From a paper:
Here we show that the major OMP of the bacterial predator Bdellovibrio bacteriovorus, PopA, differs from this architecture, forming a pentameric porin-like superstructure. The pentamer has a central chamber formed by the association of five loop 8 peptides that is open to the periplasmic side of the bilayer; the chamber is effectively shaped to the dimensions of a lipid monolayer.
The protein was successfully solubilized in 1% (w/v) DDM, and was amenable to cryo-EM analysis. The central chamber in PopAhis also has density for alkyl chains, equivalent to 11 DDM molecules, two per monomer with an additional one at the centre. The cryo-EM structure also retains density behind the helix of loop 2, and we were able to validate the x-ray and cryo-EM attribution of this to palmitate (and thus potential FadL-like role) by demonstrating high contact residency time for this ligand during simulations. The density maps from both the x-ray and cryo-EM suggest tight packing of eleven alkyl chains (the central “extra” chain having less defined density in the x-ray map), with chain:chain distances of 4.5 Å commensurate with a crystalline monolayer.
Author numbering:
A (entry chain E): 1 to 83, 98 to 344
B (entry chain D): 1 to 83, 96 to 344
C (entry chain C): 1 to 83, 95 to 344
D (entry chain B), E (entry chain A): 1 to 83, 97 to 344
The structure:
């Protein structure tokens, strides 16, 4: 579930449905599951989503997913939106994926398609998205690749013209497992997007690098206390430049026969500076953050959620569970 | 209940008391039970309803229902209401529902009769509203036939200042269902409806014809858990401006979570075919279509309380948003 | 409790403390118990009430009850009250007191219930008085029931420095018969008369109301954890020079011992076919929607039971801001 | 617990920590326990309170209590507050010390109350003080109780207005008899006198009251006891008011489960409800029926007593679950 | 858990993560664990914090903590904000490193603290640096704790106004003696000077404290333990005020069930409660009664410590169940 992955701070060691859309070899290592994320139909948060994964024999896995929305697309559309507020997100997200085991190497591929339009004279919107993700794994080595083919969103209504177009989206990840407890990974991500607000052309170009590590402090059953160090440098051309060292630690515990408790804390240690270009001014604010969540188990049914009141520290009837998901494991 | 079937995407494989009204042969296969839908009297949502079904012998069933309202009648009355001069047009007042079913050899068949009559003769409301109909269906384990015919329906308003009438000029619904496997089925139906209205001397005609073909496959269905999915092609045409070809693809599960809990969830989308054209021009609309529904039923033996998670559309389970659309069922 | 009787559709088969006030032979069939209805003081809904019933020997019962307010008295005061609320001080019953006795004379159970109420406010600003008295006599054979209710007096006065308004009951009869052909089948009939006169600064108001009722109560499903009842009734009403009504309410409901700590009750009713109310001068008619439902739960703790009604009954919502209302507490000895 | 005593209609048959302040011979019957009342600091409601009682040997008991406030002091200060006078002090830092011993066949106890506080800032200028003792003895069939307030004051020198409330007497004699372990009869005489200087306008009240009553148990059980009680109470306020009442109550405290106690009661003034005004002769007789309820969550040697917050509106919902919470630990 | 140490009135007898922060010899006596304190990021209350403690052998221990904020800093910056000046920076990205070791018969330990932040944006222009250490030792009967602060600057230079705070010293020495496992005494001296500059106008604050007190257990039990303590506190703010208090408290922590722990306490300033102004000479004696409650839900190795939100009003309802929640996972 999304809440499960968030409560563990995107630990990069977590095996989940939501973490396999970019690592499709994990669809072979997962179990047969059906998953639904609670939410609404329009452009609301959270959005309704759902899918399934099944095994074709004993060496293949196939499945589909409804309503997934990209982050690189929704973020750019949101950026252009408040700068015209009728530009469109991914309309009918369609994800197909497949994975097989060729000997000792498992490999997988996921495909994403989306299309929607509105031809009313007062609402001139249309949106199209497409991309693929290919990954192969060995158990000791790990390789992933994410490619975006097309991305577009136009609004031509009543003398107002707006567009956002994806000019490329690359995402390469390499992982190495020195042991079944410790692993090291690296990542390079380029993203060039160009938009027209009303004859005004704007172009952004994002470059990211990532080197990390995930280990285990407490080696136990019931739960494992995990910890991770990471170095991240993000360069946005002619806008800003960042360099962070996020350190996180957390645990996932089978508290009861009906409860799973997830918690983590993170903070950028020593390195938290985001220098702003064309000015030279830096920014080093507080960055300590936490996430908490619960998973209620009824045999083959699990309701993952996050504690709604963790941010204020308060948990009561009015703030109990938010970001709910349901999973059925055949 | 209206929440058990809504949480299960209104599938054609579900057998409830709320599905047996248009499939009267299903009252013989339903367990003897009494249902109460919680709500308030009058133009309220949700409305209050309830009924029963009892077996008269070894091959027969009968019962009655209270307060059930028609979707087409309500839709027509609502579309006429939004024309404040005519926000008194009445709904289906009261509402009586009788049904009967039997087993003639290997074919089981059933009938369902609907009636309604309301009146408000005060000189400043002048409202009157009536309705009637019938639904006949027969079914062997393999072949399923359903015909729905609405004889009449009216809603007149006359308060000495304005006048509004809505009339049903025809409503027929025929469905065919085939069962290859006890876990696979196909169906198709035709829906024809004509509504005549008059808003203070402005005669209006509304005509709708619908087609739909489909499949419901229940893969991985056990005695503790039932996974299913279905595909369907639905075409709908309004005489003047509306043609819509859609491909609804849904999936969902009903799981016996515990001895006191049953969890139901579903997700649906319009895959590829999500197009609705307007006839006046050639304006086509392809907007978002992902939706989900969740619900639960608390089992206390012969008593079950079914509801829908109120926070489903916001994704929250708290005590301020816990249950909605509650109904109480008692299995004799 | 009031909640329990409400969620069972004021069915004439439910034996409860609240149904035995007008059927005083039923106090010999109840167990020994003490009940407290939650509420506040004054003209507040729900009002505070409570009382007990104890067995005196083995063939007699007795008890008392605090705070019971009539329906006719409250209604008659309310119509004048809501007539610039110049008459907003008219007092309802002030301090209710009931004394009931029941004895088993041979095979016939018999019982009497007495009602007294009195209160006043002699402040010149608020010159209010209120008095009421009545009795209820009933007997039962097991198959034959006879119940008689009489209102000896009832009056509510108000004399400010400016206004002057009083209401007064000039009679209130309520004869009722009942036959039991089977432990599931029973039929009954009821005749009711009520004259009310009011004064509004010298303008008399008169209200005469006559009622007739015939109905039956039967069982569609018999169990041991919970039976299943239904009823059909014919109700005719004639408010002199105002309105006339004939109705056919039909109800159906259930009480189920869901667990060892739970009792679930629900019901639904509607006036089938015969829904009709006619005005007298205009001659007009009204036949609108009449589908009502009632739900409630009783939490059992052994000798203590908390009876409530689901507050989300009219909205279909069992949330926490809306879980239990109309709470009452009953201690059974 | 205050919620426990209120839910049971303040009857004289209840043995609670809160009923032993005015009957200090009960501190030897109570088990060794510590009580904390949830609340805030200051002129709040409820107020924070806490104390303990411990056994000193085999026939003695002692303890202390924090934050207790007197009903008469609060009422006298409130009467002046609601009639630039909203800064009058209540009892501040109230201290109670008690002791009890068994003198052969008799049990006797003493409690002492002290409360001092001040605020000498020029724009407030308030000072409050209090003192009193309560001596009681009991045998098992006879109860003798005497409460004697020694001092009580609340001044106010705002620099623009002046005020001062003073106690000029307090007397509470109470004799109780036990016609049986079940039945019990009591009597009570109370005298009080409060003198105030409302910016140069001397206001004086003089309260005289007598109570005769009984408490009886008509249903006997080992899970819970059902009780009722009748009482005649006369109250006279010199040159102002006169009231005669007959408050009748009934109630029960039941151990429903191994983790739950349930308390409920109902009361009403029967036949005698008249309050006569001694300035015009006009009387008053309105509605008296009242109810209270509460619960206790027994988690072993830890019990949390509370009152159902929705009793007045008859709603047990999550926004109106519990109120007047108090935690009790038994050593 | 902050809400635990708060429900026990910050008693010296408790062993927790923060009590170990200021007494590093306790990290060797703490069980291996990791704790996360729920909250938000930035100048928010509660703040998000978390850390762990692991054993390096059989006689050593170490760990780290994220997001801890010192109270002296959070009070000086707050009073400067209360005197525009709303952008003054609190402690940013607080880091804590601890080491403990059972050297011989002694058990020492050291805690280090560091924090740094900035905004360098011309219309905020903020900066906040902090550094300090804490050394302690204990052989079982004698405790020696020392707390020293090195840097405490916190600036603000936007276009118009110019604020500034600085710490010119912070020393805290405490000595404790343990006569029995139950009774303990302690003495503590703290001297801290804070010099601010509010837009050229200089402000100087000097504080000196002297605390001496005892902690004993009134009742003795296995699941719970009823404790109490008496303390004398004097505080002389140079040429601003002078106080002398006597805080007395009592409380308990009960293993109510296998899934529940209940904690509560009550406190008051008995007899000595005075605060005298240095210039005017006036004194204030106001109400000082207070209580605290909290719960800990045990799930085996995971414990959810919370503070009863409705304690200050005496309610337990939907909106007032838990607050100040933290999560602890014991390895």
């Amino acid at each position: 579930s999304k809440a499960r992955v968030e409560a563990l701070a995107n630990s990069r060691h977590v095996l989940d449905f939501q973490t396999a859309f970019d690592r499709p070899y994990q669809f072979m290592a997962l179990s047969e599951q059906a998953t639904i994320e609670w939410g609404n139909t329009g452009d609301a948060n959270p959005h309704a989503e759902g899918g399934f994964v099944k095994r074709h024999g004993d060496d293949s896995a196939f499945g589909a997913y409804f309503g997934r929305r990209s982050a690189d697309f929704s973020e750019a559309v949101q950026t252009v939106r408040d700068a015209f507020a009728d530009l469109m997100f991914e309309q009918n997200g369609l994800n197909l994926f497949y994975a097989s085991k060729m000997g000792e190497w498992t490999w997988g591929v996921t495909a994403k398609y989306s299309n929607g339009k509105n031809e009313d004279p007062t609402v001139g919107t249309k949106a199209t998205s497409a991309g693929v993700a290919v990954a192969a794994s060995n158990g000791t080595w790990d390789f992933e690749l994410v490619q975006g083919f097309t991305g577009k969103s136009e609004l031509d209504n009543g003398t107002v013209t707006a567009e956002v177009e994806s000019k490329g989206l690359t995402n390469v990840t390499v992982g190495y497992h020195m042991s079944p407890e410790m692993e090291v990974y690296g990542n390079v991500k380029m993203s060039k997007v160009e938009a027209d607000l009303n004859g005004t052309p704007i172009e952004v170009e994002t470059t990211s690098y990532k080197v990390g590590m995930v280990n285990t402090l407490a080696k136990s059953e019931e739960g494992n206390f995990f910890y991770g160090v990471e170095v991240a440098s993000t360069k946005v051309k002619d806008d800003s430049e960042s360099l962070l060292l996020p350190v996180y630690m957390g645990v996932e515990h089978n508290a009861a026969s009906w409860l799973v408790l997830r918690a983590s804390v993170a903070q950028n240690v020593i390195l938290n500076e985001t220098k702003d270009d064309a000015t030279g001014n830096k920014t080093d604010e507080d960055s300590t953050r936490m996430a908490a969540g619960a998973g209620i188990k009824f045999g083959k049914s699990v309701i993952d959620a996050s504690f709604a009141g963790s941010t204020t520290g308060v948990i009561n009837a009015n703030n109990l569970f938010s970001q709910v998901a349901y999973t059925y494991t055949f």
